Design an enzyme around this catalytic site. Structure first.
Site, short mmCIF file in Angstrom:
data_model
loop_
_atom_site.label_atom_id
_atom_site.label_comp_id
_atom_site.label_asym_id
_atom_site.label_seq_id
_atom_site.Cartn_x
_atom_site.Cartn_y
_atom_site.Cartn_z
N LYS A 1 26.05 22.22 -16.12
CA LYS A 1 25.71 22.17 -14.84
C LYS A 1 25.64 23.48 -14.05
CE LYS A 1 28.69 18.13 -15.00
NZ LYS A 1 28.89 18.16 -16.50
N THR B 1 24.36 26.34 -14.84
CA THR B 1 22.87 26.65 -15.14
C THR B 1 22.09 26.25 -13.94
OG1 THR B 1 23.56 26.89 -17.63
CG2 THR B 1 20.96 27.12 -16.78
N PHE C 1 14.23 30.60 -17.34
CA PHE C 1 15.07 30.30 -18.34
C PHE C 1 14.39 29.98 -19.53
CE2 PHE C 1 18.61 27.46 -19.73
CZ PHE C 1 19.45 28.69 -20.10
N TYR D 1 20.72 -17.72 -23.55
CA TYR D 1 19.59 -18.11 -22.38
C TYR D 1 19.73 -19.58 -22.42
CZ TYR D 1 16.27 -18.14 -18.91
OH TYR D 1 15.58 -18.45 -17.72
N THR E 1 30.10 16.05 -22.21
CA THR E 1 30.56 17.52 -22.25
C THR E 1 29.64 18.41 -22.07
OG1 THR E 1 32.11 16.38 -24.06
CG2 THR E 1 32.09 18.91 -23.60
N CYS F 1 0.84 -1.21 -0.15
CA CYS F 1 0.04 0.23 0.03
C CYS F 1 0.93 1.30 -0.12
CB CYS F 1 -1.04 0.12 1.09
SG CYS F 1 -2.24 1.37 1.15
N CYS G 1 -0.72 3.49 3.45
CA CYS G 1 -0.98 3.04 5.07
C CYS G 1 0.41 2.26 4.92
CB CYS G 1 -2.27 2.45 5.26
SG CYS G 1 -2.39 0.50 4.58
ZN LIG Z 1 -3.65 1.26 2.81
#
Ligand SMILES: [Zn+2]
Ligand SMILES: [Zn+2]
Ligand SMILES: [Zn+2]
Length: 1102
Positions: A105, A107, A74, A850, A101, A10, A13
């Site tokens: 960052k 900004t 911006f 596999y 490159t 949940c 809760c």
């Molecule tokens: Zn719940």
């Protein structure tokens, strides 16, 4: 959904919820009785049941504001990188800024500081150079409103500003302070006593230049030196440390480490902020490798005339470098050098004054510590293959050579001794130089043995990958193209290089014939000018969840492990790709399992239908006992040190908030689909974007082809999984009880199939003693042995009829699970379980397809692997591609890369790839050879049919004598035999016995048989046999045959006498058939559950 309950699923809760609701991203019925609520937060609030969901509401909201704000103040919207960063920032988390490159960052740091100050949070922006402070403050001031207190400090500061900054920093409640790294280092105590909510470090290396700065920045968020020293002792030890749960620090954000994060200090970030300062290792490449056959400077001239601009030449030594330099200088090419005028020619190349840069493997790669501009370097030319060369004499010989020689010949088993000492140990036991070099050329596969001048050439693949890589990176959101040309004439060197390049980078090298220079040059130039344009960004962040750590390891090997966030039970790795960021982590097994507590052994019943109930798995890290029930300690050894998959689940739900899209990458079977659903259902309320990918190979190709085949969860497979689980649970529990009350022990029956198989073994013992026909073996003169009916005594074998015939024999189909287990466990002295494990590690390390398949089907790509390998070994005229089957879920167990076992051993002892025991190598050898055999041409053989008379009896025997035409017998040995002539062969020795017609079982025989009867599946075979062994029902004898014990016989006798219905082969096969029909959506889930319940109810009365 599959209508089932999960105990902590949940969203609000934190308790039990049904599959069907989480699927719709809803809280439980307790939290919200309504069928289909209009708005979740509003409805939770209305009913006053709003608890933890608040967290998410506030999250989403507080993010969408940020975004909005960013998009307003911006230019446009956030890029994927900045999106992930934003989402991490509203959670208050600290991290490295892993990105290519200059994605911007500064900004993001600016807009973050702005958005925070907008509320009232104070942030600091740190830069290495004093000019970046000026520029950043410049850009800041003009976009920031009056409410933001902005200050600065650097070198050329004023005479009243320097003190203004200090008094304001002392008392005046600032908002954003922009300063250098120097100021951090110099005024440690001043900053240490202040508290910041956001700290942005542009260059981590400059601030990691001093050890004090770590403690400084750590104290810039409110962390005492006590925790720092304690953590320091813990990291001096060699293990992890834990932060006090009662701590709330600020947001420290840094960029990628340029140099290797050397020192002990940075580990303090791992415990106080939970982020590791990583380096920027980008494996994103778009390079085309071409190979030219001759070192002709005319070819090089023509090429250079095509490329024209931005070329990088690499020479073996400096001598050929200078030679080539002179030759090109004369031919009027604007050229430079690295050995003479390094910087001049380097930067002259950087601007454009130089079109061609000529360097060495040793000079360039060590002096390019300056810049190394990618937007200029389009083409890389290798004048010879980069390689390490060793001497092949009695002296001058390295360790690994004499190692692989002596270990295989006679001296070594497995040992490590001093080098020169080993030389002086082989100085007596070796024969000659000739014999030595011959042993080297015979043993060493995958390298080049120059027996001419006594040399060993090992192509340096890493150096080739780096140097070639200098021509392709990500620029302005565009992964630009680059050409790597190799000038090599020696075929062995080129082949070696190509095999190891396919092994590490999975990149192909093509020939000059299959390469159009004009087209390639065009792609290069065009991608360059495409990156020059104004950027629009479509990068997305991606989360990828797998079940085993090994998958994650080999995934990190081709995605590149830049940084790793440790998140509770798990360790999520992050990687940069051309499509955006990419996060991947491992679950470490299953998450949920059937509860034992309630209902019918866990399965509840309501409204005529059955409802499975699951709870998170718990594994004691000490004794290893697993359980589902919620306990504080281990129910067996009473220890608290446990692993709780619920923590793992919570962690996943946390990570899922950052990622834009999520993909579950569990194995392509029913089991994996179940796990994938257990996860997707749990995450579904948190993140809207969840899908499924099935990887059949753990390589870049397997991943790419997986993403092309993305899909939602298939519920029929989940249903199938559930049905089998419930059958094993119910039948297992009932039968096990019935045995508790008969043989004392508690757990005895894991299911129905087990018992069936045991019956086979037990009664096989009985029908084995009855096949006892008397026989006699005869060792013949000038021939082989012959097996004839018992009690012969004439010592003379005559030949009567003798004929021959040519026949064309096809090879065996590729390995499936049954086949593999059988033949591999037979040819080796290994159990089917050991084999199965080896296969699992083999697939999970991306070496085979596999390993759980019931199909023999083989794709054009597999045939292609076979083809290229045969073309590599020269015998490509024996290639015959065979699909083998159209009806196939997955392919058969085959190699993924055209590399044999010997080459693997070479790469392993060399150190390229590691972690493969000898047994792994042998198993892989078997798979490989079987696959190529299956892809080779039909062998034409001549065999004879000899009718011989032995004591008044005519007996014919058919044997292969001559292999008239080769084919698949090159990989799989085809046994010939000495010819019989129409004479009289006399008997040398008579060995009388009585070997039985119907033999006993072996593990291989058992797997083969249950495959042949329709009992069990590729995932259960080995587990079944092993279980039979572990319960003491069965043992192995002299010649390793499977025999029933006392206990086993007792058990099957009881079970057959009383519960014959639930052990009969017919019933087991019918159930396997029906469930397998459920897997395909042909038989009803609930209905088969009803059936199983109806027979269980009958059993619970006996
Ligand atoms: Zn719940
Ligand atoms: Zn559903
Ligand atoms: Zn325990």
């Amino acid at each position: 959904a599959v209508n089932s309950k999960y105990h902590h699923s949940c969203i609000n809760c934190g308790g039990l919820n049904t599959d069907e609701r989480n699927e719709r991203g809803l809280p439980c019925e307790v939290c919200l009785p309504e069928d289909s609520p209009s708005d979740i937060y509003r409805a939770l609030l209305e009913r006053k049941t709003l608890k933890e969901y608040r967290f998410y509401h506030e999250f989403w909201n507080e993010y969408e504001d940020f975004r909005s704000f960013f998009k307003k103040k911006f230019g446009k919207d956030l890029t994927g990188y900045q999106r992930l960063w934003a989402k991490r920032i509203v959670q208050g988390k600290s991290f490295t800024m892993v990105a290519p490159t200059g994605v911007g960052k500064t900004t993001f740091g600016m807009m973050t500081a702005l958005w925070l100050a907008r509320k009232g949070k104070k942030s600091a922006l740190v830069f290495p150079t004093v000019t970046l402070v000026k520029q950043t403050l410049e850009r800041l001031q003009k976009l920031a409103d009056e409410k933001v207190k902005i200050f600065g400090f650097y070198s050329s500061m004023k005479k009243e500003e320097k003190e203004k900054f200090e008094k304001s920093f002392e008392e005046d409640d600032y908002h954003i302070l922009v300063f250098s790294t120097q100021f951090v280092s110099k005024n440690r105590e001043k900053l240490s006593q202040k508290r910041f909510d956001f700290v942005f470090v542009d260059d981590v290396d400059a601030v990691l230049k001093a050890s004090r700065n770590i403690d400084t920045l750590l104290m810039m968020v409110g962390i005492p030196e006590e925790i720092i020293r304690k953590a320091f002792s813990t990291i001096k030890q060699g293990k992890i440390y834990e932060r006090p749960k009662n701590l709330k620090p600020g947001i420290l954000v840094v960029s990628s480490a340029t140099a290797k994060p050397r020192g002990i200090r940075p580990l303090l970030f791992r415990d106080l902020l939970n982020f590791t300062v990583g380096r920027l290792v980008s494996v994103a490449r778009n390079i085309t490798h071409v190979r030219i056959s001759s070192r002709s400077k005319e070819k090089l001239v023509e090429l250079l005339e095509i490329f024209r601009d931005g070329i990088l030449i690499f020479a073996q030594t400096e001598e050929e470098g200078k030679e080539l330099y002179e030759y090109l200088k004369r031919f009027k090419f604007n050229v430079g050098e690295t050995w003479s005028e390094f910087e001049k020619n380097f930067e002259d190349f950087k601007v454009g004054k130089i079109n061609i840069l000529i360097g060495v493997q040793a000079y360039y790669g060590k002096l390019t510590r300056g810049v190394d501009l990618p937007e200029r370097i389009k083409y890389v030319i290798f004048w010879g293959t980069p390689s390490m060369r060793f001497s092949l004499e009695l002296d001058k010989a390295p360790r690994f050579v004499l190692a692989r020689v002596l270990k295989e010949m006679g001296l070594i088993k497995a040992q490590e001794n001093p080098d020169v000492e080993e030389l002086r140990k082989i100085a007596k036991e070796h024969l000659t130089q000739k014999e030595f070099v011959e042993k080297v050329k015979e043993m060493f596969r995958g390298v080049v043995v120059k027996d001419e001048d006594l040399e060993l050439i090992i192509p340096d693949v890493y150096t080739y990958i780096q140097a070639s890589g200098r021509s392709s990176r990500i620029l302005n959101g565009v992964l630009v193209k680059g050409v790597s040309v190799i000038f090599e004439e020696d075929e062995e060197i080129f082949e070696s290089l190509k095999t190891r390049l396919l092994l590490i980078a999975e990149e192909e090298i093509i020939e000059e014939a299959e390469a159009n220079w004009k087209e390639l040059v065009h792609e290069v130039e065009e991608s360059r000018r495409r990156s020059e344009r104004e950027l629009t960004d479509t990068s997305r962040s991606l989360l990828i969840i797998v079940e085993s750590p090994t998958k994650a390891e080999t995934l990190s090997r081709f995605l590149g492990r830049a940084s790793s966030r440790k998140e509770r039970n798990i360790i999520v790795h992050e990687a940069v790709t051309g499509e955006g960021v990419i996060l991947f982590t491992a679950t470490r097994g299953h998450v949920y399992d059937l509860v034992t507590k309630g209902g019918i052994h866990g399965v509840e019943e309501e409204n005529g239908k059955f409802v499975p109930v699951y709870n998170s798995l718990k594994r004691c890290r000490d004794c290893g006992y697993q359980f589902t029930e919620d306990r504080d300690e281990c129910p067996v050894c009473s220890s608290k040190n446990i692993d709780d998959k619920t923590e793992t689940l919570r962690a996943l739900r946390e990570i899922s908030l950052e990622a834009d899209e999520i993909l579950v990458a569990t194995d392509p079977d029913v089991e994996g689909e179940k796990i994938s659903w257990d996860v997707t259902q749990y995450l579904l309320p948190s993140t809207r974007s969840l899908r499924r990918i099935e990887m059949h190979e753990i390589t870049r190709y397997g991943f790419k082809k997986a993403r092309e085949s993305v899909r939602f969860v298939d519920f029929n497979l989940v249903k199938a999984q559930i049905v089998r689980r419930v059958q094993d649970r119910w039948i297992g529990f009932e039968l096990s009880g019935k045995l508790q009350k008969r043989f004392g022990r508690s757990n005895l029956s894991a299911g129905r199939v087990q018992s069936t198989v045991l019956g086979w073994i037990v009664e096989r013992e009985e029908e084995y003693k009855k096949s006892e026909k008397d026989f006699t073996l005869l060792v013949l003169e000038n021939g082989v042995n012959l097996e004839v009916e018992g009690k012969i005594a004439d010592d003379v074998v005559t030949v009567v009829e003798l004929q021959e015939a040519e026949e064309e024999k096809n090879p065996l189909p590729p390995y499936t699970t049954s086949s593999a287990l059988s033949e591999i466990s037979q040819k080796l002295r290994l159990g089917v379980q050991e084999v199965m494990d080896i296969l699992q590690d083999l697939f999970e390390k991306g070496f085979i397809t596999y390993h759980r398949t019931d199909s023999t089907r083989i794709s054009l790509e597999g045939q292609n692997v076979a083809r290229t390998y045969l073309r590599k070994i020269g015998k490509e005229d024996i290639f015959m591609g065979r699909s083998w089957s159209t009806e196939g879920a997955h392919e058969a167990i085959r190699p993924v890369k055209p590399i044999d076992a010997r080459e693997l051993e070479e790469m392993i002892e060399e150190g390229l790839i590691a972690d493969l025991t000898k047994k792994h190598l042998r198993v892989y050898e078997l798979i490989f050879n079987r696959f190529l055999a299956s892809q080779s041409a039909a062998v034409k053989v001549k065999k004879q049919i000899v009718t011989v008379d032995v004591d008044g009896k005519r007996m014919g025997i058919e044997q292969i004598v001559e292999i008239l035409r080769d084919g698949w017998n090159l990989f799989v040995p085809l046994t010939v035999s000495p010819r019989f002539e129409h004479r009289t062969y006399k008997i040398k020795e008579k060995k009388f016995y009585k070997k039985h017609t119907v033999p006993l079982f072996t593990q291989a025989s058992i797997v083969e048989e249950m495959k042949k009867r329709g009992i069990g599946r590729p995932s259960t075979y080995a587990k079944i046999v092993e279980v039979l062994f572990r319960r003491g029902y069965v043992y192995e004898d002299k010649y390793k045959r499977v025999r029933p014990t006392r206990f086993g016989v007792m058990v099957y006798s009881y079970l057959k006498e009383r519960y014959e219905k639930y052990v009969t082969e017919e019933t087991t096969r019918r159930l396997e058939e029906i469930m397998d029909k459920v897997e395909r959506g042909e038989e009803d889930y609930q209905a088969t559950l009803r059936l199983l319940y109806e027979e269980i109810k009958s059993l619970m009365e006996e």
